[PDB]
Amino acid sequence: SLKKKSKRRTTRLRSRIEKKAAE
Amino acid sequence: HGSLGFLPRKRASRQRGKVKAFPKDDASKPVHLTAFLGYKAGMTHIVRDLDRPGSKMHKREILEAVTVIETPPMVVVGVVGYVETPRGLRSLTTVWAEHLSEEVKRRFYKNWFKSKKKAFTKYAKKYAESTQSINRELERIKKYCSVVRVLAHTQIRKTPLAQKKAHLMEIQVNGGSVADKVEWAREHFEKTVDIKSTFEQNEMIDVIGVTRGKGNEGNAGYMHRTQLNSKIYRIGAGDDAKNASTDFDATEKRITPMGGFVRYGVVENDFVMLNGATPGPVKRVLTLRKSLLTHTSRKALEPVSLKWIDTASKFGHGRFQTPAEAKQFLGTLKK
Amino acid sequence: KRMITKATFVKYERFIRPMALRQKKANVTHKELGVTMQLPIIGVKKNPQSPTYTQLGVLTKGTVIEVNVSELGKYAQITNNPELDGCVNALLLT
Amino acid sequence: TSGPRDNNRNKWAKKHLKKGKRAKNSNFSKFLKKK
RNA sequence: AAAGUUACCACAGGGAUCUUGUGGCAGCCAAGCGCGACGUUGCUUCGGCUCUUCCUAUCAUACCGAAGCAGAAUUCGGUAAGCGUUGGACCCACUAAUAGGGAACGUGAGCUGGGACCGUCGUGAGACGGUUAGUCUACUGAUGAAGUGUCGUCGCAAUGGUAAUUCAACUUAGUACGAGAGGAACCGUUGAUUCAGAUCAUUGGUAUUUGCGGCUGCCUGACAAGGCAAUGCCGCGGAGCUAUCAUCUGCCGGAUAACGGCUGAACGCCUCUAAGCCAGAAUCCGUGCCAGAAAGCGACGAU
RNA sequence: CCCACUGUCCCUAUCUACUAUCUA
RNA sequence: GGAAGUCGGCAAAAU
RNA sequence: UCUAGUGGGCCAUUUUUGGUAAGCAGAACUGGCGAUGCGGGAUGAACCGAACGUGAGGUUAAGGUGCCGGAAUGUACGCUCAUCAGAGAAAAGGUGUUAGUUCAUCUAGACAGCAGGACGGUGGCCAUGGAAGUCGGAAUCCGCUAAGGAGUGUGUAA
16 A cells, blocks of 8 residues: 555456456 | 643652653853752751732742751762763763772662772772873763763761662763863862852752652552742852851751751751652652753742741650750759 | 335325325426526326326326416526435426 | 654743853853862 | 136235436427437435444534625635533523534344234134244553573663643724724733643541540449440541642644746736745644563673 | 432542452 | 432431 | 266357347357465466475576565666656647648748838728728729738727
């Protein structure tokens, strides 16, 4: 992070990001 | 709860209050001491004129409770040299006096009576035989070390205390060059340094010591504490009979209250009277140090002239300063 | 519970129609004139969402409602959502 | 009110060190030193 | 003769089961890509006490910016969570202020307050039952064996914690300023609130000092003498404990934010910024204060 | 509601026994 | 000081 | 001929049906899992490789080669400085940087900067204590030039 927030994301969060990118 | 700066609330790991900071050294100032060791005897109440400009009791008198600490002259038995290193101060070497009194020799032993009294025997032998080693060590301190602390011990025999072990400690020698401090320590070897020479009853000093234990509470008590800005009101001399006699009172008397100090005894040596309360109960050793940072406001700068010092019987409801005037007022007893 | 959750206009009354949700005046904007006039809601012609809503007189998007046009009765279609906008904003059928 | 870390208060403390302090304390140490 | 219809439908059964500060609608434009932004026209069960911390989306305290901001008292806007944010019944008064929130069932193993099935009788209607069914760790302190030959003294300080807060009074003043009405501020100074750490000179409280005295009753045939009574009762009572019911003390350096500037290019001008550099907040980091690594260490004494 | 009263409270403090604790 | 405590004179002392 | 076991689902692609504040909902489609360990993705039911007797040697896939970690702190060319770098909130904003694309001036002297002009009818016309270009409302003409407006703003009671 170092900023305020973790760059690394939750695995279910990544997948739904992929889903949101698809639709 | 209280302040979080004092936790973890645990017992102090020392009976004698250790100095954790000394006033900053100055080459402009000549060579002197900064700390002293005394024993708490109790306090009385005194009447003092109030020369406080801008106050509502200006040119008046108030009653102040003032703690009395017996401070017999301290004996310098050695010197310690400190060299600054990238990991902090480090004790480079230590030089002791040739002859050490039994009061300070008792410190090194848990059982002085059963001991063979062998402390510093070969040290005294080598001191008398060859002084080249002592000269080499003192030259080492004045050449390499940047901080000099003199080993001094208290004359506990003069105090009315059953304890015979002297509270040896170090006093940082602030002032002058390092050579000046070394010369000062060598001249003062085996001699005595007096509180009259250290403090002079009108400056603003700090008192440090361990508080009294209150037992177990839902640990509470017996902790190292540092009181700041405790003003000296009078450095009385033990030999002088006018120590407790002011200029407005006369009435030749001694600082020890009639009936004696409760659980301490009678003060016979030089005493110090400090305004307000100080940590620790009676007969506990207290340490005094100079002001680390210079701050003399009107309270810390105004001169003080005592008017009357109470010496009534602190044991019970005492009502007579001295047995002399007590017998003058009271009718003649059967004895 | 059983109550009408949408703004409407005021056995058969099985549900409950809130008085606060009910509206009586509609802001109808004329097409040719391009002016918004606040006319009373004479009645609800037909609600395409549900005939029961039409029977209950629920004011919804696309619902036909008749309002007085004497000062300008004519029908009009509600082009807004009264449940969200908070006002019965409709456009005249002319 | 301003706290003890007030930058101006530290400045005024520095100014008053050489006005009502310092010299009268240095010689005060000197007197008991020559004692 | 009956038949269709029911989203006016009602009674049983079967299936299904991120968020915050900008209104909408209709037109006129409309950079542009039939839409079309900014603009423009209309009209209108929950609920609250304590507690711990934490967030700042800051009520007060500190410092700045702006405003017809003379002064004073304000208003708005920045940095800012260090420090606070009461006492009683929509109030109330105090107060510098009585800010908003989180701990998704804030803290109910801190705390409290404001039935289902079946049956039976039943039209448009509701009741009178039989079964029933709940499930070591952390922190606070306290010792402590041990490398360092052994024991001891005097110290070093890696690291961890931190603390002070707010107000009104004097002077500067009835000056600056103001037609007048009014009326500042800085330096310096004295007190008081809140909090923190101590202390028991004095004062109050405390009584198993069963310390002294007095009273009641009891027991020795009497006098006296004593002894008593689960601490019989009363007065005083050291010592100790204790009390914002008593008393003391509560620190200094830089670096910054907002912001004000200096030199100065970019961009032959200019510019507080780009490289650089000052001034500057109750902020930050140190100092001071507390702890001392129980597997960090030094000097020294003896053997 | 008025009056009186009191550690209910501001704000707790002290004493006593028992408990609690350790030992066999 | 005297119910300001707490939803409240609950318990004590007063009588 | 006869005789066991199976009659679920999950995930994903594509087409399509409507869509809806936004999600999604309905089919079909063949896949992957399901019966299945292994390499990699830091860790993993669904991602990239690969499918299995016990071993030796060689070589690869996917992914990697600063150190933890086996393997170049390789080679070549560029971009980027973040006082919260990097490994849907979207319309935009930025005197942040780099390339281009288009259009403009330019020895008749490019910008920029210095030295000036920046005029005459005319104070055009109204307005009102007054506004002479710059309280304001309509006009917006003009002669001279190298060029000067019925004036770009400051300013002025004007």
